Design a binder for this molecule. Structure first.
Ligand SMILES: Cc1cc2nc3c(=O)[nH]c(=O)nc-3n(C[C@H](O)[C@H](O)[C@H](O)COP(=O)(O)OP(=O)(O)OC[C@H]3O[C@@H](n4cnc5c(N)ncnc54)[C@H](O)[C@@H]3O)c2cc1C
Ligand code: HEM
Ligand SMILES: Cc1ccccc1C(=O)Nc1cccc(OC(C)C)c1
Ligand code: SF4
Ligand code: F3S
Ligand code: FES
Lengths: 616, 153, 129, 250
């Protein structure tokens, strides 16, 4: 850190939360409730966190509309994870879904109500009553079109009562580590350019995902997957990074989300020939089939020319057939959102949409206790002390290969709640606040000091763009071994351009040029790991679909009957998590693979669902 | 006697001064709109009249002048058939506009007429009746005295 | 290096802890009510002054006007007579002045009714030009 | 070469004894997106990266990008660039706020005031958390429509001249409407004590019905109005029809 001097500021808390998104805030409320001196660290105001932009709804088996068993939720979630989903985590999610969302009503979330006065639910993507046998399920509870805005503002409000101390606009640089143990976090106070070291017995990572690793995305600009990168720079393997979900109905132009609620209310996808083409691709579910299918099904129509508009390159979402007193009631957000960015009167015209990057199931590997883990091939799942994770940045996993619709706001909440529940217990008040080793994150700063005065000939702005495109091309909805190899070749050579970086802005106080550069740093780690994982995965499963490996590789062939066959070895078949372990400095990436936890938590409360062929 | 938040609000203002932090512009930069321009002209006139009543009530008291000398003094120049009623219109309008607008500005204390159509309508409505009543009050006796120069009896 | 100083938690408003002690119930609300009532009552009055002139009207005008302008100037004195931009006691000077303005106003108007044309007659005479 | 020219407010606290500035930035509208924010980014990305400013969402739902654009307080991301290349779009920060750097202002007071209204659900009978849905009717919950949407951009408090003057004491439109939002929520019980906290002559009443809040607001909402009901509520010219009856089969 030679070229400057820095104001270093220590602290001491019980538990630090890097994140003020749904998960981080819920996590905080429970810890305040428990009585911990809880520091919430966020690189922007909590209400600006991504959650806010969420639209469709949040999932729970409430049966405000009709009878519902959470076990039917649990099913559609395991089939949604294309059996790459650790079911012990999914069991936790779907069991407590009804308690957690009810909590939110009890925190003053203004859920839309049915005439009965109950929480109005709608239908959504990839759900169904009676274990896939029955109808299309109505579990997706909502505040009409704007569920995530109202969930966050509510969760935040209630966290002003938890006596939790807020560090707002603080960019977290690294997880402060002591040989296996997370003793705290380091950050940069944007307000005064001071550096802050937070000592803590625990550390919850709720940073969200890396939607900006791709060119087009519904995500917000601050989806740079920092927490995911922090873990890597502390020496942890990330999980299932190649599984990037593509949301079907992202607007043609900017890529802003048009909800799946727009489809769950009775809207549908129409090609250049005026065919509701999803009725072919999904005989049963139609336009409420899972997102990886619907987004693929779009791309097929485009790539075969029946795409619409002046480039025959996107398609339509249709709402000019639903009654306008429902559009206005159930979809006012997208109504205006479409009317602004597309100029579309949704009651008169369709909305030009296209598959778009949205959610990263992939993240920091954890158990069901939302605790970060490492995975030796012999020792197994060895946890990381003083470290927890939840939200989009985590991979429990409750989404394996494909996240279900309306499940993340729940994943954010339930496992945020879980973080505190699980910490309240396993933390004990005799355990003193850990001291920092001398010269902690002297590198963390050095790194910053480098980027701050960046001297090379590549503008930080341009190196991002070329990453984003190099990505957009190679790791699309349909990917192939030759493309991916050729992607990895470019991405790894873009990584070497990091030493050739340029930044003009030199100031400490509110340097959006410097901070964005650290985001790019973090994004490049995620991205590199995303594509090397994808290149290597020789199968089609969930979001990640390989033209050259278009069957779901499983222990058994599951189309044929089970008995009579003979289970493959762990090496050949791909029912396993992808654990990329990048060398933060050089960029070398090594892999290893970890089993899917098939068992539930209580075999007495529910049965583990056998892998059947995922059809909608 | 401050509420706990308004205490904090002060301590803040201090802390904000401390940092020599500049303040964003406002009147300097903000655009003219019929919401607050009207607010200005309600309060501009409101005051002007009260300052008149002081400059009038206390001014004529302290000074030796009675009002009857003043009314005669101006007829000294005996300014044009126009320029008088101009000043009459200038004197009616602050009372006219204000008093009308007072019924409107009470409205928005009751949530009555607070949407942008109701705001912008009322703005023209009040200016209309203030233009009418001040012109009508001023050009009525003037059109009764020039109804002597030629009259029946 | 990490030869740091230990810092403190950032300044923040605790609405639960500020709830200790706070009993202020000096319900200004009922005063607002009467300001507006009165002003609505003056809606017929201005017409009445146009039509029914006289010394006793002057008195209703000079009583009401001094009472409504008193409430008015106090408003404008609080908006612009700010402690921040004036310093505490100097703001209290304007503050007190808002009451001086009222008492000087009424006396100014009372002198004029009782030793001059009066409000009503003053308009007749200037409209007569 | 449809070169739009921009006059952006500039300022550097780093630079010793420096003062507010105005910089002119030119932008090729053919090489740019349709929204103001796109240019500001384009500018940071291609021209001067020191141009510091707040963004997060692109869809106008976060509240981060509040600022002044051609004399009005609005969100950049969903405000359209003025296509007339002979003219300039004049970009300043949110009026009468202390500026940190360029278009970034300190919020904390605004944030702190919205914290003082106890923006969360309060009920006298201690109910259990994840146990039961509380009752609220379609008519009841629909009241909040117009209130719950506020993203806390502060375009409205930044436009209110009464806020400019007495910002420390007068809560300002956006914060008030959230105070109101929690008042009329049927499920909410401690609604009198909420009024109790802004009974004084500044907190609430210093609203001189100017109406910029409602006119400037990028989400088309109406604070002036909810202030209305507060004035009626505080004067006891009105009060809320208390909770509807939660039926015994619900
Ligand atoms: C357009 C859209 C619509 C959606 N709709 C739905 C829906 O209807 N239902 C549903 O279930 N899910 C939905 N999702 C998914 C869901 O909203 C998110 O995945 C979820 O809200 C993530 O919450 P989180 O707490 O993990 O992190 P986020 O809400 O993403 O916030 C991340 C937090 O981490 C902090 N952070 C990041 N980096 C740093 C750093 N370096 N230092 C310090 N702090 C940092 C940020 O300040 C931020 O507060 C939607 C997503 C999008 C994009
Ligand atoms: C006759 C009917 C009148 C009505 C209904 C009326 C109503 C009102 C109202 C409601 C206000 C408060 C508005 C606010 O707070 O912004 C006000 C303020 C004021 N009025 Fe009047 N008024 C009337 C006549 C007058 C007259 C004749 C004067 C003459 C001097 C006057 C001077 C003022 C002043 C100085 C204020 C100051 C506060 C301000 O502008 O904000 N008013 N009036
Ligand atoms: C503060 C106040 C209360 C009630 C009625 C009017 C005002 C008032 O003068 N606003 C105001 C004050 C100064 C300037 C301004 O316009 C600027 C945009 C030029 C408006
Ligand atoms: S009200 Fe309209 S303007 Fe005032 S904050 Fe909420 S949204 Fe921004
Ligand atoms: S702009 Fe200003 S004073 Fe009252 S109603 Fe709107 S706040
Ligand atoms: S950046 Fe989200 S409000 Fe425009």
């Amino acid at each position: 850190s030679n070229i400057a001097q820095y104001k270093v500021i220590d602290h001491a808390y019980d538990v630090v939360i890097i994140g003020a998104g749904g998960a981080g805030l819920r996590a905080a409320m429970g810890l305040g409730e428990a009585g911990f001196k809880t520091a919430v660290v966020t690189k922007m105001f909590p209400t600006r966190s991504h959650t806010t932009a969420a639209q469709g709804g949040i999932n729970a088996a409430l049966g405000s509309m009709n009878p519902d068993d959470w076990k039917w939720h649990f099913y559609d979630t395991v089939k949604g994870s294309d059996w790459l989903g650790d079911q012990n985590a999914m069991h936790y999610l779907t069991r407590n879904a009804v308690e957690a969302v009810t909590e939110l009503e009890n925190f003053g979330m203004p859920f839309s109500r049915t005439p009965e006065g109950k929480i109005y639910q709608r239908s959504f993507g990839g759900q169904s009553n009676n274990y896939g046998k029955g109808g299309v399920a109505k579990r997706t509870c909502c505040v009409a079109d704007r569920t995530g805005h109202s969930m966050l503002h509510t969760l935040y409000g209630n966290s002003l009562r938890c006596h939790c101390t807020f560090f707002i606009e603080y960019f977290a640089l690294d997880l402060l580590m002591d040989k296996g143990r997370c003793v705290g976090v380091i950050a940069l106070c944007l307000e005064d350019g001071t550096i802050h070291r937070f000592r803590s017995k625990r550390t919850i990572v709720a940073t969200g995902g890396y939607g900006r690793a791709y060119f087009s995305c519904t995500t917000a600009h601050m989806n740079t997957g920092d927490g995911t990168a922090l873990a890597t720079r502390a020496g942890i393997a990330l999980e299932d990074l190649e599984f990037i979900q593509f949301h079907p109905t992202g607007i043609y132009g900017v890529g802003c989300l048009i909800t799946e609620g727009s489809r769950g209310e009775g809207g549908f996808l129409v090609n250049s020939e005026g065919e509701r083409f999803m009725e072919r691709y999904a005989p049963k579910a139609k336009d409420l089939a899972s997102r990886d299918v619907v987004s693929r099904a779009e791309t097929i129509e485009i790539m075969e020319g029946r795409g619409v508009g002046p480039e025959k390159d996107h398609i339509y979402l249709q709402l000019h057939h639903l009654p306008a007193e429902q559009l206005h009631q159930r979809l006012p957000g997208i109504s205006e959102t479409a009317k602004i960015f597309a100029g579309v009167d949704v009651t008169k015209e369709p909305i030009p949409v296209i598959p778009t990057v949205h959610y990263n199931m992939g993240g920091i590997p954890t158990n069901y206790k939302a605790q970060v883990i490492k995975y030796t091939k012999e020792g197994g799942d060895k946890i990381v002390p003083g470290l927890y994770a939840c939200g989009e940045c985590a991979c429990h996993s409750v989404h394996g290969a494909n996240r279900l619709g309306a499940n993340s706001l729940l994943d954010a909440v339930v496992f945020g709640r879980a973080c505190s529940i699980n910490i309240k217990e396993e933390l004990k008040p005799d355990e003193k606040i850990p001291e920092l080793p001398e010269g902690a994150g002297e590198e963390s700063i050095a790194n910053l000091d480098a980027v701050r005065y960046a001297n090379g000939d590549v503008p930080t702005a341009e190196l991002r763009l070329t990453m984003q495109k190099t990505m957009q091309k190679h790791a699309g909805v349909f990917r192939r071994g030759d493309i991916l190899a050729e992607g990895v070749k470019k991405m790894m050579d873009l990584f070497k351009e990091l030493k050739r970086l340029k930044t003009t802005d030199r100031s400490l106080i509110w340097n959006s040029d410097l901070t964005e550069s650290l985001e790019l740093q973090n994004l490049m780690l995620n991205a590199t790991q995303t594509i090397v994982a994808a290149e290597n995965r020789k199968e089609s499963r969930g979001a990640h679909a390989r033209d050259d490996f278009p069957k779901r590789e499983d222990e058994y062939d599951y189309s044929k009957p089970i008995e009579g066959q003979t289970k493959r070895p762990f090496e050949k078949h791909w029912r396993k998590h992808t654990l990329t372990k990048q060398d933060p400095r050089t960029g070398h990436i090594t892999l290893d693979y970890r089993p899917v936890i098939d068992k539930t938590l209580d075999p007495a409360e529910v049965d583990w669902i056998p892998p059947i062929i995922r059809s909608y | 006697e401050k509420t706990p938040i308004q205490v904090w609000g002060w301590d803040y203002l201090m802390r904000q001064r401390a940092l020599k932090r500049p303040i964003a512009p406002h009147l300097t930069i903000y655009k003219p709109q019929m919401t607050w321009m009207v607010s200005g002209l309600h309060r501009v006139t409101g005051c002007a009249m009260a300052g008149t009543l002081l400059i009038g009530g206390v001014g004529f008291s302290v000074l030796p002048l009675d009002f009857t000398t003043f009314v005669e003094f101006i007829r000294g120049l005996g300014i044009p058939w126009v320029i008088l009623d101009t000043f009459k219109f200038i004197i009616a309008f602050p009372i006219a506009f204000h008093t009308l607008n007072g019924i409107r500005f009470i409205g928005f204390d009751m949530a009555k007429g607070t949407d942008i159509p109701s705001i912008y309508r009322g703005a023209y409505l009040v200016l209309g009746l203030a233009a009418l009543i001040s012109l009508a009050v001023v050009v009525y006796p003037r059109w009764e005295r020039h109804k002597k120069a030629t009259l029946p009896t | 290096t990490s030869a740091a100083v230990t810092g403190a938690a950032p300044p923040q408003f605790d609405p639960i802890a500020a709830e200790k002690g706070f009993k202020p119930l000096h319900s200004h609300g009922t005063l607002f009510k009467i300001e507006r009532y009165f002003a609505a009552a003056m809606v017929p009055l201005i017409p009445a002054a146009y039509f029914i002139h006289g010394r006793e009207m002057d008195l209703c005008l000079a009583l009401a006007l001094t009472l409504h302008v008193h409430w008015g100037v106090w408003g404008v004195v609080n908006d612009y007579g700010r402690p921040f931009v004036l310093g505490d006691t100097l703001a209290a000077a304007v503050r007190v002045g808002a009451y001086i303005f009222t008492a000087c106003l009424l006396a100014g108007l009372l002198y004029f009714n009782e030793h001059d044309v009066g409000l009503t007659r003053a308009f007749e005479m200037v409209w007569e030009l | 070469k449809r070169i739009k020219t921009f006059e952006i407010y500039r300022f550097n606290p780093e630079e010793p004894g420096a003062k507010p500035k105005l910089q002119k930035f030119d932008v090729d509208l053919d090489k740019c997106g349709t929204m103001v924010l796109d240019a500001l980014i384009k500018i940071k990305n291609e021209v001067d990266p020191t141009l510091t400013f707040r963004r997060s969402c692109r869809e106008g739902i976060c509240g981060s990008c509040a600022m002044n654009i051609a004399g009005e307080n609005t969100l950049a991301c969903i405000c359209n660039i003025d296509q007339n290349t002979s003219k300039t779009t004049k970009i300043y920060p949110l009026p009468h706020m202390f500026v940190i750097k360029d278009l970034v202002p300190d919020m904390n007071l605004f944030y702190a005031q919205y914290a003082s209204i106890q923006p969360w659900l309060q009920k006298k009978t201690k109910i259990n958390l994840g146990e039961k849905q509380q009752y609220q009717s379609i008519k009841e919950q629909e009241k909040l429509d117009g209130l719950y949407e506020c993203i806390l951009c502060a375009c409205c408090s930044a436009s209110c001249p009464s806020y400019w003057w007495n910002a420390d004491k007068y809560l300002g439109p956006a914060v008030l409407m959230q105070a109101y939002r929690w008042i009329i929520d049927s499920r909410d019980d401690s609604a009198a004590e909420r009024l109790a906290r802004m009974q004084d002559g500044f907190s609430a009443f210093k609203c001189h019905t100017i109406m910029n809040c409602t006119k400037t607001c990028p989400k088309h909402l109406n604070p002036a109005r909810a202030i209305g009901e507060i004035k009626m509520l505080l004067t006891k010219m009105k009060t809320k029809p208390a909770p509807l009856p939660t039926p015994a089969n619900f």
